[PDB]
Subunit: 68 residues, 2 copies
Amino acid sequence: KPVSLSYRCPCRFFESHVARANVKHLKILNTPNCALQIVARLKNNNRQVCIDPKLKWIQEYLEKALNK
Amino acid sequence: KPVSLSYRCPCRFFESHVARANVKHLKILNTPNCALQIVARLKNNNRQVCIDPKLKWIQEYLEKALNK
């Protein structure tokens, strides 16, 4: 094709030190079997970086988004 | 009007019939001042749609990305 085994994972590396205050928004990619599905659009430089899905502030961020 | 220039919350209305299968990714706006923070980028038409926070499959979709 070159032959590809289904969808390729967009996020291959992640950043562990990203502050909620420096995020314009998060994108949760619909790529189920990938280890990394979270992308952050940064405020300071407007660039996208994949972020550590285990960052504690992310859980809080999403809970508020769900009005839960 | 550009988002950087508008004071109106990005999402005025929302949709309640967006199928998970037709979602490329969910963008979660870092907009705590607003009621609707979830936007879906669709696969088949690339449209951006604000969705209802109570959309059945959302919570599970988000939680899956955090438990990998």
